C-alpha cells in the first residue's frame, strides 16, 4: 500500500495502555503493510531502560498478535528508548537526540506524532517543552494525541487548550475518543448522505425524535475511586454520547472534508441549548442504582471505595434541544448508565407516523431506523405494512441486517483506527475545540445543579433500564424508548 | 364475527374449478365463522343431479379441508342444485324458484352473488337472462363474478362490457384476477402510504425506474392449445402485470375507499402511452424459448400441440411510460416468461443514486426497495452504508424481512379472498372497466405488430432470464434488472 513515513513518540511508553493496546495497534499497521521502512517509534518515561529491555517489553506487548516471530522482530528493530522526566526542560535535549537519531536511521523527513499516554497534569507541560526544546520537526507535520480526559469542566479544558495552543494549532490536536472511532458510528453519515430517501428525510418534517443509548450491564466494580466524582455524566455523556449526537445533528456539509464536516457539526453544537436550574430538573434525570434481585448485585452505596453519603449518578438520561431550523422542536434523547438490562450502544431515529388513514382498526405507526453499534453491528428499520388478517389492517415489520463474520474480522480496533487516522491527518473522526467546549458548557450547567443538589437523585433496580422518571421524560412529548432491554 | 347474509349461485357448479377451489374457499368462510345460518349456495349446470348427488360432490370437494365431519355436514345442508341450460330463457324460471326457495329456507334478504364459472361465450347471455327472468334480488345487493378472461382484445372486452351493462352497473362487476388478490400485492399501498419516507419519495425525484417481474420456471407443458394464440402477452402481461403496475403507478388517493383508490389508479392508466409500430420495436421485446442444456428442456416448437411455424411469445419484456408529472421520465419495466431461471413474482423500485460525493473510490449507488410476492413473501431494501475497509468507502447492504410461518398459515388463498371481498362489496382488489380497457388498448397495439410480424422474435435458452435484448432494453436508459435469477 502507499507507505506511511512517520515517527511516533510515546510519552508513558512503559505504561499499561501502551503495551496493552497502543503497541499492538501500531503492529497491525505494520502487518497490513502501512508502516514499512521509513518509520520509527521512540518510547519514553521516567523508568531507565536499556534498548534490550524496552524491545523485550514491546515483544511481550505484541505476543498474542504475532504469528511469524521473524516479522515481529523486523518490526521491533524500529523501536528506541530514552529515560526522561517531563518536568525537566534540559532532560528534553536527550529526547531531541533520540528522535533525530531514529529519524536519520530510517531517513524520516519530519512527520512526527507525539502520543501523550501520561496523566492529565503533564499534558500542558509536555506540549510547552516540545516547542521550547525544538522537538517539533522543522519540516513535515507535527501532530499531538491527547489521551482522555480533555479537562474535567469547561474552565480546566479551556486552560488545557490554551497551553496546547501555545505550541500547536487546533487542527494538529487529535483528542482520543473511543466511541467516535467505532466502525458503526462512521456508518451514520453513509446511511444519511448516501441514501437520498434518508438524506431528504433528516429533519423536523419526517423525524419525531432521536434516541442515543449507551447501556452497560456491569456496575462500578473497582473504578469507584474516580467514578464517584465523575459519574455517568462525565464518564459517558459529556464525551461519547455528545460526539455521537454531533454526527446525527450536523447540517449537510459542503463536502466530506474534515473541515466541512466539522463546520457542519459546529453549526449544530452552537445551536444546542444550555440549561438553568429549572430546565435541568425538567429535561434531565439523574439516578443511582440500588439492589437487584440477587445479593451480588449490591447497591451503588455498598460498592468498594464508594462513600455511603454519595449522591453520584450511575445513570443519566436527558433531552437535548437544537435551535436550528432543521431540528425545530425535535427532541434528542440520550441515556447512559451502569447496571442496566444489557450492554448496548445504539441510535434510534423515530419518524413521524403518516397521516394517511386507511380506515383500518390500526392506523399507521412511527417507523424506526436503528443503528446498533455494540456489541454486534446491526441496522434495523421498522416499517409499516399490511397485517395478515382478513380485514385490511396495518402493522410494523422489522427489516434487519447484521455484520458478517468477514466484516467482523477486517474491522480495525479503535486505537489502530485513531492512530492510523492521525498519521494520515484525518480529523473527521475527532472532536474539535468547538465541539468539546460546547459539550463541556452543556454538561457544566448540569453538574452545577447536581453538585448543589438542587435536583432529585432517582434510584433504580439493577437489571432494569433505569428509573421510571426516564420513561416519563419521553412520555411528556408523547415518546418512548425504542430499546426496551 | 359479524355474520354475512348472502346467497351465491354457481354457474358451472359441476366444473373442475368449482369443486377444486371455489367450494373449499367458501367452506373456509364457514369455518372462520363468517357464513353461519342466513346463507345459501345454489349450484347449477346442464348435468341433471338430484340433491344427494350434488351434496356428495361438494363433500368430495371439501374432503382435504375437513377435520370435523359434523361441521362439514352442517355446511353441506346449505347447498342446493337445479339442472339448467343457460341458453334457455324459460329454463331460468326453474332457477328463480331454487333461489327464492333457498332464500326463504334461511331467511336471506336479497344479497345475491352470481358466479359464472362457465365459458366466456355464456357470460353475456347469462347476464341478460338474470335480468329478464327477474333473478335479481328486488332488495339487497346483486353482484356478478366474471371468471377469466374478460375479452381477448379491446373490442371483444367492450362487447362483453356492453352486454353486462344492460343488466348490471360497473361497481357490481367483480372480475377475477389471481395476482391482484395476493397478500403481498396488497402490502404495496401500506408500504407506500403508511411510511412517509416512501410516500414522499414515490415519484420522479427519487425513483430511477420501477421493475415488475413474473418469472416462471415451467414451460408450456399441456396448455399449448390456448397458449399458442395468447402467449405471455395476454396470459401474464395484459392482466396480472398490468394491474400490479396500477397499484404502483397510482396517484395518492383522497382516501382509501375503493372509489378513491380506483380514481387514483385511473389517473395513471389514462396517462399510459399506447405505442405504434416503431415504438413497439423500441420499447418492447418478444421472445420464444429454445433448448436448455438438457434434452427434457425441449424448445417451444417441439412441445406437444405447438405448430412448428409458430412465432408465439413465451416471454415478453417492455418499458411503460406514464405522461403524469409524478412519473415524468420514469421507466416502468415489466417482464413475464416461461422457462426462466425461477418462479418469482416481485417488484423492484430503484431509487436514484445520491449526488453527495464522499471522495471514496466507490461513491453512492442506487438504493432498491423490493417486494417479493411469490413464493415466500419478503421485503428487502438495499441501502448505502460504509464498507469495512481502512479507507472510507461506501457499499450496499441488504436489509431483509420474510413472512413468518404464522403469517404463512393465516394468509387467505386468492379465491377465498376474492369471494369474501365480493360478499362485503370491496372492489379495492378488483380491476374496473377503465383499467381493463386501457390494459387492452395498450396490449392491442402490441399484438397488432406481433400478428403482422413487424417485430423480431428473439430466442433464449431455457433456464436463463430471457433474451439479451431484454437486458439491452434497460441498458438503453442506463438501467438493469435487479433480479438476476
Ligand atoms: Ca417537552
Ligand atoms: Ca429510452
XYZ file of N, CA, C and O in Angstrom, chain B residues 124-214:
364
model
N -72.294 -13.003 -21.422
C -73.310 -12.027 -21.788
C -74.721 -12.572 -21.687
O -75.619 -11.912 -21.162
N -74.904 -13.789 -22.183
C -76.193 -14.461 -22.171
C -76.730 -14.592 -20.748
O -77.801 -14.057 -20.419
N -75.969 -15.281 -19.903
C -76.356 -15.473 -18.515
C -76.745 -14.138 -17.895
O -77.796 -14.023 -17.269
N -75.916 -13.121 -18.101
C -76.189 -11.800 -17.548
C -77.544 -11.286 -18.016
O -78.385 -10.906 -17.201
N -77.758 -11.306 -19.328
C -79.007 -10.854 -19.926
C -80.228 -11.514 -19.276
O -81.165 -10.821 -18.860
N -80.199 -12.843 -19.153
C -81.322 -13.584 -18.566
C -81.555 -13.408 -17.065
O -82.690 -13.535 -16.604
N -80.502 -13.122 -16.303
C -80.654 -12.903 -14.864
C -81.583 -11.703 -14.663
O -82.362 -11.650 -13.704
N -81.485 -10.746 -15.583
C -82.296 -9.532 -15.562
C -83.697 -9.818 -16.109
O -84.696 -9.486 -15.466
N -83.757 -10.449 -17.284
C -85.022 -10.789 -17.942
C -85.961 -11.615 -17.062
O -87.100 -11.212 -16.806
N -85.484 -12.768 -16.602
C -86.287 -13.647 -15.767
C -86.299 -13.283 -14.285
O -86.352 -14.164 -13.429
N -86.256 -11.983 -13.997
C -86.283 -11.486 -12.627
C -85.555 -12.281 -11.556
O -86.123 -12.568 -10.498
N -84.304 -12.638 -11.833
C -83.481 -13.397 -10.892
C -82.786 -12.475 -9.890
O -82.390 -12.896 -8.804
N -82.663 -11.206 -10.265
C -82.031 -10.209 -9.419
C -82.905 -9.886 -8.209
O -84.102 -9.644 -8.345
N -82.290 -9.873 -7.032
C -82.987 -9.572 -5.791
C -83.624 -8.185 -5.842
O -82.957 -7.197 -6.155
N -84.912 -8.120 -5.517
C -85.641 -6.853 -5.512
C -85.213 -5.995 -4.321
O -85.606 -4.835 -4.194
N -84.427 -6.596 -3.435
C -83.902 -5.909 -2.265
C -82.525 -6.482 -1.981
O -82.245 -7.629 -2.335
N -81.665 -5.688 -1.353
C -80.330 -6.161 -1.053
C -79.475 -5.956 -2.280
O -79.919 -5.318 -3.234
N -78.275 -6.520 -2.295
C -77.410 -6.323 -3.444
C -77.464 -7.467 -4.446
O -77.960 -8.556 -4.152
N -76.874 -7.221 -5.604
C -76.797 -8.192 -6.675
C -75.412 -7.961 -7.259
O -75.117 -6.872 -7.751
N -74.552 -8.970 -7.163
C -73.179 -8.868 -7.660
C -72.835 -10.041 -8.581
O -73.324 -11.159 -8.396
N -71.978 -9.785 -9.564
C -71.597 -10.803 -10.535
C -70.090 -11.021 -10.602
O -69.328 -10.067 -10.758
N -69.667 -12.278 -10.549
C -68.251 -12.593 -10.611
C -67.877 -13.198 -11.960
O -68.245 -14.331 -12.271
N -67.146 -12.429 -12.760
C -66.734 -12.865 -14.091
C -65.383 -13.580 -14.090
O -64.342 -12.950 -13.886
N -65.395 -14.884 -14.350
C -64.167 -15.671 -14.392
C -63.315 -15.199 -15.574
O -63.811 -14.518 -16.472
N -62.022 -15.511 -15.535
C -61.078 -15.118 -16.587
C -61.321 -15.906 -17.874
O -61.680 -17.083 -17.817
N -61.090 -15.289 -19.051
C -60.626 -13.919 -19.303
C -61.765 -12.956 -19.630
O -62.838 -13.373 -20.065
N -61.514 -11.665 -19.451
C -62.512 -10.646 -19.753
C -62.150 -10.088 -21.130
O -61.472 -9.063 -21.235
N -62.580 -10.785 -22.179
C -62.279 -10.356 -23.534
C -60.936 -10.915 -23.954
O -60.211 -11.458 -23.125
N -60.630 -10.839 -25.243
C -59.360 -11.327 -25.791
C -58.718 -10.202 -26.603
O -57.702 -10.396 -27.278
N -59.340 -9.031 -26.518
C -58.918 -7.825 -27.211
C -59.766 -6.700 -26.624
O -60.618 -6.947 -25.760
N -59.542 -5.467 -27.066
C -60.348 -4.364 -26.552
C -61.796 -4.523 -26.998
O -62.712 -4.475 -26.180
N -61.993 -4.719 -28.300
C -63.330 -4.856 -28.862
C -64.180 -5.964 -28.245
O -65.323 -5.719 -27.858
N -63.620 -7.164 -28.106
C -64.367 -8.265 -27.512
C -64.702 -7.940 -26.057
O -65.794 -8.255 -25.574
N -63.781 -7.266 -25.379
C -63.987 -6.875 -23.991
C -65.048 -5.773 -23.893
O -65.863 -5.771 -22.967
N -65.051 -4.851 -24.858
C -66.023 -3.758 -24.877
C -67.408 -4.358 -25.091
O -68.382 -3.937 -24.458
N -67.476 -5.350 -25.982
C -68.715 -6.055 -26.290
C -69.234 -6.672 -24.995
O -70.365 -6.403 -24.574
N -68.384 -7.466 -24.348
C -68.738 -8.122 -23.093
C -69.261 -7.092 -22.091
O -70.301 -7.301 -21.458
N -68.544 -5.975 -21.963
C -68.930 -4.910 -21.041
C -70.318 -4.392 -21.362
O -71.116 -4.141 -20.461
N -70.600 -4.229 -22.648
C -71.898 -3.735 -23.085
C -73.020 -4.680 -22.636
O -73.961 -4.259 -21.958
N -72.881 -5.964 -22.959
C -73.882 -6.967 -22.585
C -74.137 -6.938 -21.075
O -75.286 -6.849 -20.635
N -73.062 -6.971 -20.288
C -73.164 -6.945 -18.829
C -73.798 -5.655 -18.304
O -74.569 -5.691 -17.344
N -73.491 -4.526 -18.943
C -74.037 -3.232 -18.530
C -75.526 -3.060 -18.811
O -76.130 -2.055 -18.419
N -76.107 -4.019 -19.526
C -77.535 -3.984 -19.816
C -78.297 -4.523 -18.606
O -79.494 -4.284 -18.469
N -77.581 -5.204 -17.709
C -78.170 -5.794 -16.504
C -77.537 -5.340 -15.181
O -78.186 -5.380 -14.134
N -76.269 -4.937 -15.227
C -75.544 -4.501 -14.034
C -74.804 -3.185 -14.249
O -74.521 -2.790 -15.384
N -74.473 -2.526 -13.141
C -73.700 -1.287 -13.157
C -72.276 -1.767 -12.884
O -72.082 -2.743 -12.156
N -71.283 -1.074 -13.428
C -69.886 -1.489 -13.270
C -69.417 -1.849 -11.859
O -68.738 -2.854 -11.675
N -69.799 -1.058 -10.862
C -69.397 -1.329 -9.482
C -69.964 -2.640 -8.921
O -69.746 -2.963 -7.748
N -70.698 -3.381 -9.753
C -71.284 -4.664 -9.364
C -70.572 -5.811 -10.067
O -70.835 -6.984 -9.795
N -69.684 -5.467 -10.987
C -68.948 -6.461 -11.737
C -67.618 -6.732 -11.070
O -66.756 -5.857 -11.005
N -67.454 -7.945 -10.563
C -66.213 -8.331 -9.911
C -65.437 -9.313 -10.783
O -65.711 -10.513 -10.765
N -64.482 -8.799 -11.559
C -63.670 -9.630 -12.449
C -62.567 -10.335 -11.671
O -61.806 -9.693 -10.946
N -62.455 -11.645 -11.851
C -61.443 -12.433 -11.159
C -60.038 -12.175 -11.694
O -59.816 -12.185 -12.903
N -59.101 -11.930 -10.780
C -57.696 -11.699 -11.120
C -56.836 -12.273 -10.000
O -56.820 -11.753 -8.881
N -56.114 -13.342 -10.324
C -55.250 -14.044 -9.373
C -54.240 -13.202 -8.589
O -54.320 -13.102 -7.363
N -53.298 -12.592 -9.302
C -52.246 -11.803 -8.674
C -52.695 -10.541 -7.943
O -52.019 -10.092 -7.023
N -53.855 -10.003 -8.303
C -54.360 -8.797 -7.652
C -54.835 -9.119 -6.231
O -54.744 -8.286 -5.322
N -55.321 -10.344 -6.044
C -55.796 -10.777 -4.741
C -54.763 -11.553 -3.940
O -55.119 -12.427 -3.145
N -53.484 -11.250 -4.154
C -52.403 -11.919 -3.436
C -51.896 -11.044 -2.297
O -51.561 -9.876 -2.505
N -51.816 -11.632 -1.104
C -51.377 -10.950 0.117
C -50.296 -9.878 -0.052
O -50.484 -8.732 0.359
N -49.178 -10.234 -0.678
C -48.091 -9.279 -0.867
C -48.440 -8.049 -1.709
O -48.030 -6.936 -1.377
N -49.233 -8.238 -2.759
C -49.634 -7.138 -3.639
C -50.387 -6.048 -2.879
O -50.278 -4.859 -3.199
N -51.137 -6.451 -1.858
C -51.893 -5.506 -1.042
C -50.998 -4.742 -0.060
O -51.395 -3.704 0.472
N -49.781 -5.241 0.148
C -48.830 -4.599 1.047
C -48.296 -3.318 0.442
O -48.068 -2.343 1.156
N -48.158 -3.310 -0.880
C -47.654 -2.155 -1.613
C -48.203 -0.826 -1.108
O -47.443 0.067 -0.749
N -49.523 -0.703 -1.064
C -50.145 0.532 -0.604
C -49.718 0.884 0.820
O -49.434 2.044 1.118
N -49.660 -0.124 1.687
C -49.278 0.066 3.086
C -47.846 0.588 3.213
O -47.582 1.528 3.963
N -46.929 -0.035 2.486
C -45.536 0.365 2.492
C -45.427 1.817 2.048
O -44.853 2.657 2.743
N -46.032 2.104 0.904
C -46.021 3.432 0.315
C -46.685 4.506 1.162
O -46.013 5.407 1.650
N -47.995 4.399 1.355
C -48.749 5.395 2.121
C -48.601 5.330 3.637
O -48.895 6.304 4.334
N -48.170 4.188 4.155
C -48.008 4.049 5.594
C -46.689 4.597 6.121
O -46.557 4.884 7.321
N -45.709 4.749 5.232
C -44.404 5.260 5.626
C -44.054 6.496 4.830
O -43.594 6.396 3.690
N -44.228 7.685 5.429
C -43.934 8.967 4.784
C -42.615 9.024 4.013
O -42.564 9.621 2.938
N -41.560 8.391 4.531
C -40.266 8.397 3.838
C -40.375 7.800 2.440
O -39.618 8.177 1.543
N -41.320 6.878 2.261
C -41.551 6.235 0.966
C -42.641 6.978 0.206
O -42.523 7.226 -0.995
N -43.694 7.350 0.923
C -44.799 8.084 0.338
C -44.255 9.311 -0.387
O -44.419 9.445 -1.596
N -43.558 10.176 0.343
C -42.989 11.393 -0.239
C -41.908 11.136 -1.294
O -41.576 12.025 -2.074
N -41.362 9.925 -1.310
C -40.323 9.562 -2.267
C -40.895 8.857 -3.498
O -40.166 8.587 -4.461
N -42.194 8.563 -3.470
C -42.849 7.874 -4.583
C -43.103 8.800 -5.771
O -44.239 9.207 -6.014
N -42.039 9.106 -6.512
C -42.104 9.998 -7.670
C -40.781 10.085 -8.435
O -39.785 9.460 -8.058
N -40.780 10.896 -9.489
C -39.618 11.104 -10.354
C -38.344 11.554 -9.642
O -37.254 11.108 -9.979
N -38.491 12.466 -8.685
C -37.353 12.996 -7.946
C -36.485 11.938 -7.263
O -35.261 12.052 -7.265
N -37.109 10.902 -6.709
C -36.369 9.854 -6.012
C -36.230 8.544 -6.765
O -35.296 7.781 -6.503
N -37.154 8.250 -7.675
C -37.093 6.980 -8.389
C -36.448 7.023 -9.758
O -36.748 7.888 -10.579
N -35.560 6.067 -9.991
C -34.850 5.954 -11.252
C -35.692 5.164 -12.251
O -35.841 5.568 -13.405
N -36.209 4.023 -11.803
C -37.049 3.158 -12.628
C -37.741 2.122 -11.743
O -37.273 1.839 -10.632
N -38.870 1.597 -12.222
C -39.631 0.586 -11.493
C -39.612 -0.696 -12.308
O -39.656 -0.650 -13.538
N -39.540 -1.837 -11.627
C -39.491 -3.136 -12.297
C -40.495 -4.148 -11.754
O -40.585 -4.341 -10.537
N -41.257 -4.775 -12.651
C -42.234 -5.797 -12.262
C -41.811 -7.090 -12.954
O -41.589 -7.111 -14.169
N -41.718 -8.167 -12.183
C -41.277 -9.439 -12.722
C -42.167 -10.631 -12.389
O -42.467 -10.894 -11.219
N -42.616 -11.318 -13.439
C -43.459 -12.511 -13.342
C -42.682 -13.612 -14.059
O -42.835 -13.825 -15.259
